[PDB]
């Protein structure tokens, strides 16, 4: 049935666009990884490579 | 008379209340909020 929206509607009736993310993180081959944006390089000074 | 420990002072975190008297000591692990040691007595 109809689910129309009006701007005059107040809190509790305004349209709320909703997106939900589902994750299946488990012991399986990984396709997506969040990185550390990488840290820049240095020379001639002891570092943990 | 005694010692005070803890961190961040305010009731946000806990603190220590080491103190001696005559033949007694009391310790209290409580969120003690204060500003100075002034333990009025003598």
């Amino acid at each position: 049935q109809s689910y129309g929206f009006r701007p005059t509607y107040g809190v509790g009736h305004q349209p709320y666009r909703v997106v939900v993310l589902s994750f299946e993180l488990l012991h399986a081959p990984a396709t997506v990884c969040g990185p550390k944006k990488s840290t820049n390089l240095v020379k001639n000074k002891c570092v943990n490579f | 008379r005694g010692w005070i420990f803890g961190t961040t002072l305010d009731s946000k975190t806990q603190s220590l209340l080491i103190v001696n008297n005559a033949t007694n000591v009391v310790i209290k692990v409580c969120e003690f909020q204060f500003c100075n040691d002034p333990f009025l007595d003598v």
Partner: protein
């Protein structure tokens, strides 16, 4: 063209470098509550899909 609730719009994500720190300007973000997996420690985890 956000789809209706009865016909929800599902998308599959493939092998990708996902940074969950640039999307903060994509929506007003009225509510960003999250479950057992924390949004703060979310860009250091690798997901199967």
């Amino acid at each position: 063209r956000f789809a209706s609730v009865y016909a929800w719009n599902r998308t599959r994500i493939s092998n990708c470098v996902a940074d969950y720190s640039v999307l903060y300007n994509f929506a007003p973000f009225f509510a960003f509550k999250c479950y057992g997996v924390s949004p703060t420690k979310l860009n250091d985890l690798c997901f199967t899909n």
